[PDB]
Amino acid sequence: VQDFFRKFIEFQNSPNEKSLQEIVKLVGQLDLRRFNWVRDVFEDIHVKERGSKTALIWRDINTGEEAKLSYHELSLMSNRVLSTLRKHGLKKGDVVYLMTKVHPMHWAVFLAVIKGGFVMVPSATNLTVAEMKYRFSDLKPSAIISDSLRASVMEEALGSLKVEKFLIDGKRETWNSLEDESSNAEPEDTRGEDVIINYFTSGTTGMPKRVIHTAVSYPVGSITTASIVGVRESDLHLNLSATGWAKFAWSSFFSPLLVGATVVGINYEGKLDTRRYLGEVENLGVTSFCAPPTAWRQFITLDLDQFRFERLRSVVSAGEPLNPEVIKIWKDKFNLTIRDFYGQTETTAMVGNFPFLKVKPGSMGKPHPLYDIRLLDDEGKEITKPYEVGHITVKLNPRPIGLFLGYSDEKKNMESFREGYYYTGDKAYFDEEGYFYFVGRGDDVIKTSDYRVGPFEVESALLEHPAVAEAAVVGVPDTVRWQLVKAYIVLKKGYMPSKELAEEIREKMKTLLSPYKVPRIIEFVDELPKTISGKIRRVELRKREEEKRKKGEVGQNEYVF
Amino acid sequence: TVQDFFRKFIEFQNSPNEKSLQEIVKLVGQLDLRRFNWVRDVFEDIHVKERGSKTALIWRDINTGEEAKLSYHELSLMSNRVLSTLRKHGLKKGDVVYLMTKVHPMHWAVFLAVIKGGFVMVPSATNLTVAEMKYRFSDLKPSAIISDSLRASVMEEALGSLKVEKFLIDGKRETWNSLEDESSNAEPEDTRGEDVIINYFTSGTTGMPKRVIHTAVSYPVGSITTASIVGVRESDLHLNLSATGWAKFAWSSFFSPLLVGATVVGINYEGKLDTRRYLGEVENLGVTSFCAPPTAWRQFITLDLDQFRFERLRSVVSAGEPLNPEVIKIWKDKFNLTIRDFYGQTETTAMVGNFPFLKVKPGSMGKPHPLYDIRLLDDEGKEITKPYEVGHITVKLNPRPIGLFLGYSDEKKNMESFREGYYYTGDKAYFDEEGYFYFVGRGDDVIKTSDYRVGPFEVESALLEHPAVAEAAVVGVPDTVRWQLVKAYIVLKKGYMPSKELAEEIREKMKTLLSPYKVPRIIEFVDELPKTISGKIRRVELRKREEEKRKKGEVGQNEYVF
Amino acid sequence: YLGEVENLGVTSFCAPPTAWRQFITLDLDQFRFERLRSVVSAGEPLNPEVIKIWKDKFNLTIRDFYGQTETTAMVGNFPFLKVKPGSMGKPHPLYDIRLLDDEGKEITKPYEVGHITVKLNPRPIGLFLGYSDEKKNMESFREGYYYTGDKAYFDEEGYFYFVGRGDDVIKTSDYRVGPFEVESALLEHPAVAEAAVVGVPDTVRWQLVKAYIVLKKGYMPSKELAEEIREKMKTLLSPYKVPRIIEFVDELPKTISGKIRRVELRKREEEKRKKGEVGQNEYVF
Amino acid sequence: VQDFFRKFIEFQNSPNEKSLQEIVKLVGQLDLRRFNWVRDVFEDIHVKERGSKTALIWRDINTGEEAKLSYHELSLMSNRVLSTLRKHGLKKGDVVYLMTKVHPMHWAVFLAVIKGGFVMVPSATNLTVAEMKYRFSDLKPSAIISDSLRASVMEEALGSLKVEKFLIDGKRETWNSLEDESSNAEPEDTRGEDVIINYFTSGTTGMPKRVIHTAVSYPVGSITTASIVGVRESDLHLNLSATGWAKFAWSSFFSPLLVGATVVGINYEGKLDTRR
Ligand SMILES: CC(=O)OP(=O)(O)OC[C@H]1O[C@@H](n2cnc3c(N)ncnc32)[C@H](O)[C@@H]1O
Ligand SMILES: Nc1ncnc2c1ncn2[C@@H]1O[C@H](COP(=O)(O)O)[C@@H](O)[C@H]1O
Ligand SMILES: Nc1ncnc2c1ncn2[C@@H]1O[C@H](COP(=O)(O)O)[C@@H](O)[C@H]1O
């Protein structure tokens, strides 16, 4: 059980196809009835074997602060969290919202939750009072944990609920410290199928729902991720990614701590300083770096002769496609291939260009053998022809380990899991050597700037404005953000289409929505293309935008910001 | 136009029809209800003026024997002494008044005084516990409270030591006041039509009970729809069998009869309904229009019905639950009357109904009242255009119908009920090829035992108050007598063993916390509750399992029926 | 209960077919029963399929045996006796057991059904003294035989097979039930003019108690009435006796004399079963 | 053109070569895009024009039991079935195994299935636990329907697969009745090419496979059969065949009910007694 990860860690130091398959087989034979990744892996293969190796190197590029934590200090610090939580009467399964910046105490809380068998809800720091109140309606908090920078937002969204509140940095009235109880509490003997994580994620139909992950799905699924990423024990590993999302669990937390590596974490407020971040990469001698194509696109526009990166060995991308031209520029300069790979909040990494895999540009590589990946056509028959597009699906008998339990929405489960497959809602084709190529969403779900965006959620917030009668939100091609959020608005009788109105509505949306969700374009239209029932055909809104692009024509009341 | 409306309406009542209904509809739309006060404008200005000395109320208590008769005049006087006495104790417009009494003239009196004085009345039922009442006070603080002497201690204990003015409708008690102390002349409050006069605490599927907010027109003028479906006239003696703290008392014991200048008949009884004696009193008092709930109706038809003639009875009606086709038929075959079912919620007035002129199809609540825009929507929220297709009963909001509440005192609950231009009733139905509606059931987990709406969480909560109870799930189980039974599934804490004596001990505790209708009639102890991936109780599968067990007439291993 | 059987290492176990029927539905790989050597059933017939499932698993035959309150065991598959499924075995030599026909002559031919009787000269030892009721003695003790009121046939090896009651006595869930007792209790409801209680086939409980009720003038047939009457019966009758079905009828089939044909109420139920219909005023609980 | 069947029925009362050819040509001009033989032929022609003609005369030569059903009573009885199935949550295309003796309720269920757009899998009464398990491996049941004589075989072949189960004669624990619902359910608007029947047939190479029939292939193909057979409306028509095969549909069901005849059905257990 312990022996498994020691074999895994070796696999990493020189991986290949064949040895991967052995790893695969061995996972199937783990006994995972009672499992707790902190106790069993963190504490019993790292705190014990490398307890005073650096687990985490942290740095805030604004403040300048640095902090360095060994596997020991980190395990202690996390126990003080879990002791403090338990002291405030937190039983197993209790809900804990976690909204903090990148900071050691983030990792700490992660650990305390996993160990204590709590349900953590990662909450992003750019979430609005509105978004947070939505979350509370859907899943009531037993405790919430914030930094002092976003305490007001939680305080306001909470309103008049009893919860236990906690600050990771600084004091605030009726908030508590996390390091003031004893750094000894015991494991919760968790079932491997027990819930530890809920991720609110956007869908194509309704408001965002919780994706449910267990004490093995992420803690042991992340193998697939770690394996594609090619993170080793020797590595100093950084993931450019934010605090409320899956990619952090993926590569800022699980994948590095699985293999006993040194995590590198960098915090910044506001806008990313491309140069400053890359300076901190080189300056801290990171060896493995995962960043999103959004970031990569911005990096390659720097003067890259200002860097050596002698210490950097692995570079990876995920969440959107990776332009062949990006890959090439970075290679020609630093002699490294940015290895793209694929997955969702609902899963771990499912497909990827592994270290040992020859990259074909604009291909996310081949399936990880721990997922049974199939292209299905519209009728749900399996595609076994090259260059034919279909739905990316996961075969459910046997049920892969890294796959979420389901959504907190039983209807959405009925749409996504069926005839013994889970549909990712992504479309692709494969080639003659089994390399997969991402085509796009079969959904109306949007990805601006490596953020998953649900239409209804923006449409909803739009109907909050007195002027707005109807709204349809679609994503439009943009080289920098992949997609832009555009809104079609039908106006109530009484209001007329002006730029000043468009702006007024946008500024309203800024108080209700996460920035990435606030439409960059607004177009007033007399009506929305609809089916006979009255369902919006967001498909045809998109097609129409395309034909308009090819004749460089603006809509009559289309307002760009 | 404003007085003339009611005079046109009262005629529609004496002989109604499709076409003349539509005219009534149109005329309501052209009322000026910007500043309106139903007591001044209708009670006083029409009824007290034109029929001041006709009997407004005939009252009887079947237990005590006590009886009363009040004319529209005496009642208006009586009500003014109330309003004068309230004002004397410093009651301004919008002030909250809990009213917890038996059926009694002074109840009507207070209703009037409240509406006229522009106060916010909170109808409170007489079977509410100290606990329930304290909950209410946490949610809305009382400026004054009004009780009978039978439930004064309950108010006194739930109050604790809040400042309030207190009032007794029958007898003396220390620090309680009389309501007939000041002069029977104090003036209307000029209410806006949208001003609040009523708040109703109602159960939901999700949490503790919240307030439904009604205005000086929503009930006082919405009730038209009700009165119209009911078919109450001026010449009628109209009895509604309903208890004091709920929307149906307003609907049929108060507004619908007094709108059309009828004689109200009010019958009070404590405790358990004596079907044989109540129907004897109906006949004996020559009621002519009778609303009763299907629960009552179900009990009546089991009598030997050759005991009664019902010489004087011409209209019979039901509301609040479905009305079994077999009930309708038995009563018809005997007395040659159709019991007309009709539909609505605390949140509304009557929205759908078998009107007097409408051919009844049994097990249908009839057709929508044209003063509400009723739509069946499917799951995606698109309007249903096909017979025998089930969907959500909704109210279209532009324009906003008149009898519809303002909203809940809870903004989360408003966000659920008011969506994409529709207020969802959370009821499901299908219509037929002639546009008759058939009730299917709740989209919710809300329960209706014995014509009382019951919230699961409320009872689940009270159950966790018992040391032994680790988890609880409260569902309604099919029951012919009360439509649904409140059953609790209980997971036990380690230490306590599933026994009849334990089930009882828990139940008797729940009796001190919960209104009787809420106290589970069954308690079944289980190892676990079937759950989704979320942790949410599959009340779905609890019901399916109950069904398979019913077909083998077997109880669960530790299911205790009381 | 099965856990406690194993846990206490019982070696001989007698339960009724009702129990046995319920046991075989369990997942029976939970149990070893390493200490159990004898298993027996009595009070109603023992389905061949029950016997088989228990044998295939635990390697024991559930040995059926027959008797009544009035007696001790009169017929039975003894330990040494090859069990033929659906047979209660052979007569115990301390009772003189005879199949008689309706005319009271002894049946000596295989596969012919008759009344199970006990020959009384000399009088077997385990046989009750009689009833405290002289009428009931007149019916049971006749021409030097006690009639059990059970019907059976024997085969070519003298093995007895249960057919059913020649009475109107009912056996729900291994409890013997009298019609008149339930009919009596039913007259206690003001609405009830007459009542006829019969048993209807049920695989779980052998028979269900059904009541046919004629109503007094004034009351009309409803489900709500049926229920009201049943709930009343619950306060008067042991639960096994409380009718699971109530059917309102205009009249009860009668002979020329006016005697209720409970026989024909049963036959009618059978014809209805064979076209899978429930009745027009039959209310199932 | 439903006038087709009225022309067909007459063709039957006195056929010949020439008039046959007309029938042929008229079938080619049918609109079979949306079709439902129960609604369109059974109900709309026969129940309407001869509702109180005897549809079925039934006898069990072993028990003695006999039944006589008019086109009306049969249509009602079938609706009770379909109502009951729907009540247990049966959508169109759902699989229904049907294993019963020759009995009225068999025809009833046939009708309910065709009307309700279900996929029926006729299963003969002599099929073993093994053979039935094979069937379930190949196509999973949503519901199964048996007589009480073969309930244990279904129960055992199922093991504990979730299905709705139904008995045509008698009660049994966790089996449901078919006539406790309403005497009217609405037609399923079937496409003509929609599947309503699957028949497990033996072949040379493997274990048995399913033959797939549609809402027209049998319900309208049977014409050819009915025309060769020469069955008329006036006739009392008996087909000696067993319940889980094509020849039952062919001649105990479709060919007679196409032309509005009286079906005669005889049930026996065990070996055929040719002189009785
Ligand atoms: C067991 C007991 O004492 O029963 P008891 O309550 O006195 O009733 C006696 C009646 O039980 C029935 N009965 C008893 N044993 C049976 C068996 N092996 N097979 C079938 N029926 C059986 C008969 O019908 C008896 O006449
Ligand atoms: N390599 C990739 N190329 C294109 N899209 C990707 C890639 N990796 C992930 N995605 C998208 O990211 C989605 C999941 O979003 P999230 O759950 O936020 O990681 C997938 O459904 C894809 O649509
Ligand atoms: N006639 C009726 N038939 C069926 N359900 C009804 C009927 N009237 C009321 N109900 C139910 O009772 C609810 C009204 O609750 P209340 O606010 O207590 O009157 C409705 O939302 C229905 O779901």
Short mmCIF file of N, CA and C in Angstrom, two decimals, chain A residues 278-318:
data_model
loop_
_atom_site.label_atom_id
_atom_site.label_comp_id
_atom_site.label_asym_id
_atom_site.label_seq_id
_atom_site.Cartn_x
_atom_site.Cartn_y
_atom_site.Cartn_z
N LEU A 278 8.22 34.93 -14.07
CA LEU A 278 9.19 34.08 -14.73
C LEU A 278 10.56 34.26 -14.10
N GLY A 279 10.85 35.49 -13.64
CA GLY A 279 12.05 35.75 -12.86
C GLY A 279 12.08 34.91 -11.58
N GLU A 280 10.93 34.80 -10.90
CA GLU A 280 10.81 34.01 -9.68
C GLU A 280 10.89 32.51 -9.93
N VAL A 281 10.43 32.08 -11.12
CA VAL A 281 10.65 30.69 -11.52
C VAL A 281 12.16 30.37 -11.57
N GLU A 282 12.92 31.13 -12.37
CA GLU A 282 14.34 30.95 -12.56
C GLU A 282 15.09 31.13 -11.23
N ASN A 283 14.74 32.19 -10.50
CA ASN A 283 15.37 32.57 -9.24
C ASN A 283 15.21 31.47 -8.18
N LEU A 284 14.14 30.68 -8.22
CA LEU A 284 13.92 29.64 -7.22
C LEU A 284 14.27 28.27 -7.80
N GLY A 285 14.79 28.25 -9.04
CA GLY A 285 15.24 27.04 -9.71
C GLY A 285 14.18 25.95 -9.76
N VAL A 286 12.98 26.35 -10.15
CA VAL A 286 11.97 25.35 -10.40
C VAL A 286 12.50 24.43 -11.50
N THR A 287 12.08 23.16 -11.44
CA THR A 287 12.46 22.14 -12.41
C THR A 287 11.25 21.64 -13.21
N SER A 288 10.08 21.56 -12.56
CA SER A 288 8.83 21.19 -13.21
C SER A 288 7.86 22.33 -13.04
N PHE A 289 7.29 22.82 -14.17
CA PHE A 289 6.36 23.94 -14.20
C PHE A 289 5.14 23.60 -15.06
N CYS A 290 3.95 23.66 -14.45
CA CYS A 290 2.68 23.58 -15.18
C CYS A 290 2.06 24.96 -15.20
N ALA A 291 1.76 25.47 -16.40
CA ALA A 291 1.01 26.71 -16.56
C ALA A 291 -0.07 26.53 -17.62
N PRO A 292 -1.20 27.29 -17.58
CA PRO A 292 -2.23 27.24 -18.63
C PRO A 292 -1.82 27.93 -19.94
N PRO A 293 -2.33 27.52 -21.12
CA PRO A 293 -1.97 28.14 -22.40
C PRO A 293 -2.13 29.66 -22.37
N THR A 294 -3.09 30.15 -21.58
CA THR A 294 -3.28 31.58 -21.38
C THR A 294 -1.99 32.24 -20.89
N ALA A 295 -1.44 31.66 -19.83
CA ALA A 295 -0.16 32.08 -19.32
C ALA A 295 0.93 31.90 -20.39
N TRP A 296 0.97 30.75 -21.04
CA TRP A 296 2.03 30.43 -21.98
C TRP A 296 2.04 31.44 -23.12
N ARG A 297 0.84 31.78 -23.59
CA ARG A 297 0.67 32.74 -24.67
C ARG A 297 1.30 34.07 -24.27
N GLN A 298 1.15 34.45 -23.00
CA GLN A 298 1.68 35.72 -22.51
C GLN A 298 3.20 35.67 -22.30
N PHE A 299 3.73 34.49 -22.01
CA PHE A 299 5.12 34.36 -21.67
C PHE A 299 5.95 34.55 -22.92
N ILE A 300 5.47 34.01 -24.04
CA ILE A 300 6.27 33.92 -25.25
C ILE A 300 6.38 35.28 -25.91
N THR A 301 5.66 36.27 -25.38
CA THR A 301 5.68 37.63 -25.89
C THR A 301 6.74 38.44 -25.13
N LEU A 302 7.34 37.81 -24.12
CA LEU A 302 8.41 38.48 -23.41
C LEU A 302 9.66 38.41 -24.28
N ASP A 303 10.64 39.25 -23.94
CA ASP A 303 12.00 39.08 -24.42
C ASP A 303 12.60 37.96 -23.60
N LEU A 304 12.76 36.78 -24.22
CA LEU A 304 13.06 35.56 -23.47
C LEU A 304 14.57 35.31 -23.35
N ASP A 305 15.37 36.26 -23.85
CA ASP A 305 16.82 36.20 -23.77
C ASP A 305 17.28 36.66 -22.39
N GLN A 306 16.34 37.22 -21.61
CA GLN A 306 16.61 37.62 -20.23
C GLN A 306 16.64 36.41 -19.31
N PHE A 307 16.45 35.17 -19.80
CA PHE A 307 16.36 33.99 -18.95
C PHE A 307 17.23 32.85 -19.48
N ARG A 308 17.79 32.06 -18.55
CA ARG A 308 18.51 30.83 -18.86
C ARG A 308 17.64 29.60 -18.59
N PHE A 309 17.01 29.56 -17.39
CA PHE A 309 16.25 28.42 -16.90
C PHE A 309 17.10 27.14 -16.93
N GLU A 310 18.34 27.19 -16.39
CA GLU A 310 19.25 26.06 -16.54
C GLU A 310 18.72 24.87 -15.75
N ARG A 311 17.84 25.16 -14.78
CA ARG A 311 17.42 24.23 -13.74
C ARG A 311 16.05 23.64 -14.09
N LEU A 312 15.37 24.24 -15.07
CA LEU A 312 14.06 23.82 -15.51
C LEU A 312 14.19 22.66 -16.49
N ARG A 313 13.48 21.56 -16.21
CA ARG A 313 13.57 20.33 -16.97
C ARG A 313 12.22 19.92 -17.60
N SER A 314 11.08 20.18 -16.91
CA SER A 314 9.74 19.78 -17.37
C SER A 314 8.82 21.00 -17.48
N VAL A 315 8.10 21.14 -18.60
CA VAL A 315 7.11 22.20 -18.80
C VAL A 315 5.83 21.62 -19.40
N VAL A 316 4.69 21.96 -18.79
CA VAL A 316 3.41 21.35 -19.12
C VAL A 316 2.27 22.38 -19.14
N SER A 317 1.19 22.07 -19.89
CA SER A 317 0.02 22.94 -20.06
C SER A 317 -1.26 22.11 -19.95
N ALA A 318 -2.34 22.74 -19.49
CA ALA A 318 -3.62 22.05 -19.38
C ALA A 318 -4.81 23.00 -19.26
#
